[PDB]
TrEMBL record, chain A:
<keyword id="KW-0693">Viral RNA replication</keyword>
<dbReference type="GO" id="GO:0003968">
    <property type="term" value="F:RNA-directed RNA polymerase activity"/>
</dbReference>
<keyword id="KW-0808">Transferase</keyword>
<dbReference type="InterPro" id="IPR001407">
    <property type="entry name" value="RNA_pol_PB1_influenza"/>
</dbReference>
<dbReference type="Pfam" id="PF00602">
    <property type="entry name" value="Flu_PB1"/>
</dbReference>
<keyword id="KW-0547">Nucleotide-binding</keyword>
<feature type="domain" description="RdRp catalytic">
    <location>
        <begin position="265"/>
        <end position="455"/>
    </location>
</feature>
From TrEMBL, chain B:
<dbReference type="Pfam" id="PF20948">
    <property type="entry name" value="Flu_PB2_2nd"/>
</dbReference>
<dbReference type="Pfam" id="PF20952">
    <property type="entry name" value="Flu_PB2_7th"/>
</dbReference>
<dbReference type="Pfam" id="PF20947">
    <property type="entry name" value="Flu_PB2_1st"/>
</dbReference>
<dbReference type="InterPro" id="IPR048298">
    <property type="entry name" value="Flu_PB2_CAP-bd"/>
</dbReference>
<dbReference type="InterPro" id="IPR049115">
    <property type="entry name" value="Flu_PB2_C"/>
</dbReference>
<dbReference type="InterPro" id="IPR049106">
    <property type="entry name" value="Flu_PB2_N"/>
</dbReference>
<dbReference type="InterPro" id="IPR049111">
    <property type="entry name" value="Flu_PB2_middle"/>
</dbReference>
From TrEMBL, chain C:
<dbReference type="GO" id="GO:0003723">
    <property type="term" value="F:RNA binding"/>
</dbReference>
<protein>
    <submittedName>
        <fullName>Polymerase 3</fullName>
    </submittedName>
</protein>
<dbReference type="Pfam" id="PF00603">
    <property type="entry name" value="Flu_PA"/>
</dbReference>
<dbReference type="GO" id="GO:0039694">
    <property type="term" value="P:viral RNA genome replication"/>
</dbReference>
<dbReference type="InterPro" id="IPR038372">
    <property type="entry name" value="PA/PA-X_sf"/>
</dbReference>
<dbReference type="InterPro" id="IPR001009">
    <property type="entry name" value="PA/PA-X"/>
</dbReference>
Amino acid sequence: MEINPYLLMLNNDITSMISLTYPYTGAPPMSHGTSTKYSMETVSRTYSYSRTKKEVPSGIFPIERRKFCNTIEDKENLEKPNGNVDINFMLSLAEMLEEKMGKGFFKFCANEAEAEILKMHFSKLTEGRQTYDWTSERNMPAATALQLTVDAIQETQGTFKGTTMVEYCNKILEMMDWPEVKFKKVTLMITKIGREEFIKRICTINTMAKDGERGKYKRRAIATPGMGIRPFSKIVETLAQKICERLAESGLPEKKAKLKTTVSSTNSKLQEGQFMVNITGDNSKWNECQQPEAYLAMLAYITKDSSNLMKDLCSVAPTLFCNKYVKMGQGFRAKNKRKTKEIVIPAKKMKERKELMNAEWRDLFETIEPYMDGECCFLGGGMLMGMFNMLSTVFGVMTLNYREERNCYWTGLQSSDDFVLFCISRTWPEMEMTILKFIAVCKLMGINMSLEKSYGCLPELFEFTSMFFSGDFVSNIALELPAFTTAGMNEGTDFTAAMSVIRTNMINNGLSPGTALMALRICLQEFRATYRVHPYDSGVKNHRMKIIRKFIETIENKDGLLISDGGKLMNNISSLHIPEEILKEDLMDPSYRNRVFNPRNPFTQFAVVSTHSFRTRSNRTMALEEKRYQVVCNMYRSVFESADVNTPIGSMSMGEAIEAKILDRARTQFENGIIGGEEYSEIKRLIEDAKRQRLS
Amino acid sequence: SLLLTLAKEYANLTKDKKSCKLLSQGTVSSYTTFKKWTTSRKEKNPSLRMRWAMGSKFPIMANREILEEAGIPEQWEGIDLWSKKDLGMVLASPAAITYWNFCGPGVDNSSVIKDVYKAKFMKKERWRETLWGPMNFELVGKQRRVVETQPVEIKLNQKEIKELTMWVLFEDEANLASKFIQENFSLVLSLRELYKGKAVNKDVAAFMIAHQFSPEKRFLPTFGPIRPERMELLHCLGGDFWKIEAVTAVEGFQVCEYDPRAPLIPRRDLRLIGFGKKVRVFVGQGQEKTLVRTS
Amino acid sequence: VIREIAKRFLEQATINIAEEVVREYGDHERTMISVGVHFQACCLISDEYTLEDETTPRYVLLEGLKRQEAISKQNNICSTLGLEPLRNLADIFDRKTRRFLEVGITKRESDEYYQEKFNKIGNDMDIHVFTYEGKYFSNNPNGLEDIQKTRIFTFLSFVSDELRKENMFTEMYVTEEELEMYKSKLFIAMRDESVPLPYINYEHLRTRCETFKRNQAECEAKVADVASRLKIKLEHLEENKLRPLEIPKEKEAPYTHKFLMKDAWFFAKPHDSERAQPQQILYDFFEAANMGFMTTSPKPIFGKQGLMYHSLWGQTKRAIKDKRNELEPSEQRDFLCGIGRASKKIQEDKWQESREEEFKQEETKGAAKRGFPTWFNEEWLWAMRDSKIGDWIPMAEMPPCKNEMEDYAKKMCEELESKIQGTNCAREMSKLIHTIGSLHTECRNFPGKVKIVPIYCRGTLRGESTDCLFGIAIKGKSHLNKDDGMYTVVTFEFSTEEPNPSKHEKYTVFEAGTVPVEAKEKKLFLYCRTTGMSKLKNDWFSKCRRCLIPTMETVEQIVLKECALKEENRVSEMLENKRAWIAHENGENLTRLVSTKLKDLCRMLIVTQFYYCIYNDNQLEGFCNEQKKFLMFLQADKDSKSAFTFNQKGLYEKIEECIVSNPLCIFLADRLNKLFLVAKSNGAKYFE
RNA sequence: CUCCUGCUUAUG
RNA sequence: AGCAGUAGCAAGGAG
């Protein structure tokens, strides 16, 4: 007897039989070695999709520049993806866009964006993902990168008194006018660097390999920028964020009701002979065919009547994307015929060591050479991952609101790289005409629809952001399994955080109740297996159940114990919002309740109930700056006992209010309190000597 | 400490030049990045690292003087619970945690825990006194809404909540006393008679006041009535293909200017050394003036 | 929001008046708030005590007002007294002091603003400058003792506290004393160079984008794009070219799982609570499973290396006989678990050049291709067949239930839990959890030391909790820095079936001896296999218990959709009287299927989720994407919606690109082709 | 190919 | 040998 699981799809829908075909239970794919060939395929493929040869030499940068707009050499295979944007066509799509809703659209949206840039603190730059710090040329979190950047500003010339977005950006442009910048290297030697290397370094974007990406056989490289490009990108993402929130055919911030309203609305506007065919499309090479010169053209049109500050402030990040550098990873390796000795060639010596590469490496390397730096590469038309995502959706709304003038047209919905198009027409050759006109407008503007991964039907049978919609029923996003148990902090914050994740996946996704009870019992079992705690009735005898089994006769009511201390489960599906202690403190023994909840404990001293919070030991394998900075943190937190809650206002001085605060509470505790001359005069002498020592 | 050694360590740890280039000559903003600065990058597998930590013998960093004041070195059969390695912090085993949980001293703190977590004990009482019934097994569906889900009776808007705790516990560096604050100042006058003398930590006080008053606004899929008592039980009451419900039921003072040589008398004696005097007031983060009472 | 906070600290109606003043001023954004504060400043000056006797007011307000009536009211107040201008329009006129009244409010120390105003007018007007900080620094004529000064310092400390709330410091700037970007030297040559090709500078591009109107020659370029297209859609009702996939016709794929599933044999004993560590289970099975009758011939049946496995098995046999699990260093463990077998990583500091001696280069190949396996059906049908040992997976207890749907979820958990604990898939999950768990803790607690870790389980036999023993595992001195690292495990397995050089391709099968089996005394084979796990793969196999979530999610979607469309609580009989079509036979396929119960369906679902938990590679991921595409085509066949595709050549190039050697991928491709054969019997979009 | 080196007691 | 797939691990140093 042969056996086949997919026969389950012979009498059911695909809304229930699609989690069967997601392998989200096994191990995610990882990358290995270097991330050089992936980036060379991205850059060389980006130049290979530009369809041009017209070069303009640069007088600023020592590398050539290839133009990307309005320089087309029309090859016969136009189905191959092109990277050329017609600016008159897309500005015609901008006027055709704003003429559908309102007249003062870009002025009102640009005033809403302009209202909320001047009221932004620059610490918002530190609430991001991992960035590329150029001090040591590594990948660091954003707080350390802004730490070394602000330390470079205060180290080179003058101090920093900005505390805003605009004066920080003007400080970056002031660094672009500076002739020599001094920063710290290796034990802290202060080195200097000139002017051209600062421009070559401020436009540096690091490329690595994307780890943990489900769904590709071949790996794709991700790129993270520096810090001196980020806040202008925050400006553009706020502007385009307000534009996408104002629109009606976008789904970046409900994604379910809008398709109901466009299916129900556009099916209600048919003739007696017209009908509708929907096409699921998925744009391929979306990160290599969105040039920032089109962003420079459109963002000079959105800001035509906005201000003088915003008109100049929304045309800066597209230029830095127009002259960006691409890192090369860390090189490659070479070995002999015996395969024993293997030298490592870095990305620096790749120019000299050209004679030790494969056929594919020399095919990707000989067609990338005249755009190479000594250590980096040059790109002027790419837009990689980790960049503008809220602004290409505006292009997607522009292509899906086109007017060609019968009475045949289209509509739909756009996402990051998924689009669902609804066509309304009369006959099938006119369907060829309208679909080929959609490929015409997307192909002329610069959006390459993939032909292999696109299809369609007459009713709703489409794919959009991995949610398969049938004719009547609706599937959900396939849930990530390993996000259930990644708390790993405490005996108290592993189970309640698991119930919070089961709660938010129960409310957000479907998560049927028996599946939720099963997942709660599995996370309970790995909780009991991690911390080695079992119920008392089981015969488990390890280094913690001996004490619990020995002292079980001292506890009167047996269900008053905790799960982490030798008790069974009392939380349920209807008890996920209540932790175990608050559910069980009405049944504990008073000796047990007084015994466990002692704040005089050797484990807590040195957002749930804290009674088991221990700290594990650190590892055994920049350490002065955290010493001094955390001395400032413990000091300023010690002076102002309520300062981690409120934002620390006041920027005239810190230590003046500290000294007047120790005089304030020393005099406050003194005058109807202590009353003794040596303590008040002693603290007075220490504060005065600290002020004379500090201020001089 | 008791605010007698803070000036000594303030004197000895401000002897550096670069600390003077930072304090009062540098960036006050970067304290907001000094609080979140540490080199703990991502911790991409924390539960795996906890399984490796609990696989050793002594993973725990515990205090010394309390457990050598009360505890025992080795148990009745060879269970090691101590170390002699190092600052003064001694490694230990979770068998010492359960030994503290079964053979430790007891301190009466029923009213403390049963006054800090009053919102969640109120959730336990409101979950205990409800009733359910039959199910439906029918189709259901509705769009997503923005619902505040907690049965509060004050309903601030996430901006007067920081400002309330700051204008209750330590009113000096707090915030403005604003135009949306006069009724909230009647609330301060009603709440200064509550949180004056307590043994609760101030961050825990900001936790309980920041949680017992705040309607938590969320973006959740709702259906049926949107009454705020049955909205925190949204996960239990209905799903996508099923539905079940059968529920039938005093400083009224002022300041003037900065000039006169005021007597060095702070806010602690602001009432008895009050009227008819130009008495100076030190307002918090650095804004200190000289005060005249205005009728 | 400007309007929300501006309605918080500043008054209600004054917003509209100040906004009208900005509507009479120009394209300016921030000054609203300043003018609004200024207006309430005048409202705090000139409201309550405005010279009530002679009710015509002392403060003639002609600054914040409509820009039509200041000249008329100026010519209505000054027509009796008559004054002289002071080179500027006066803010507020006065008749008690018979002078002007200037109002200005500033942030800084008020010295420089008052000296620049001293450069403008001197002190011949009546200057009133109020600071947010609290400095009444103005002209010598003053207010007497009134609460106008007290309330205006209360109001500017008020508004200044609002400035310190939302970080509004570069927002109260008067235009004469924010809207200018720092025009640098090198960025202005950077933006002018990054313009498109028909443009010269950013100024010409900005004026042309400000002066752009669309035309109707857009459709000339659009139809000119349609003309040079050469693309037609491809239907399915006339050209149903959904052809079967190219499974490679090459050598059959080997058994590539890390352990043994179906060819396993074990020894059972009653389990004791005290002897519970894996070394103590290894020792107790050294007395229980007799190694004294474990005689291995020095000649293997097949394989490559025979002497090293014999000396290594004897070395670990007498090593366990001395009751210590640490192999002493000899040539056998120096050859099997790699010690000294790595490439010399030499940096680019010295190269020691030579005339064509050690000529170094690089080379990459890819992956080897294999064929369709035939050994997978019997392991699938064994994998859902019941074994009499009872529960295998250590599942936790049931919480106490209310009168809610917890009887429904308790019923589903107890029935599906009662069905999956007895199958052999639960035995393999217990094998992976206990074995890779113990190997994982040995990979943490002792690097650099070769351990001897058994391969075992624990299950209930005749009610009594027993444990088993499947193999002997050897760790390979893992130094796991990153998520990879690939430590080498040497596995000695116990088997009770005769080997096969087609299936067991990666083994070095010996012969061990005799085993009595009750129902005469059959043979006993020992297997040998060197392999390698990884650090991330230890967490993803050591936590393979969480396969019940997609299985029970699928079954509960079936049942909740069924009672969702039947509108009646029919659950306990629907879980019994509902068929599921699986397992078409070998000789015939055309509408000859096996309708089974739903409990065998959740058996097969936990089987396929477990095999998804084992064989996760790149190829299974990309193949699962493409089979979701063909599943959408088959759903397009189930309703005859007349779907269409644009290019059916490169699609099969991408599917046939991502099928190389993974046996689960080849098996699901073959069963997908047989799904197309069964679907060809009813719908017409496929081939034979 | 040859020559020299190491602690972390693991419990469904 | 082996893991693994478009390149790395399978200890390090000296000759």
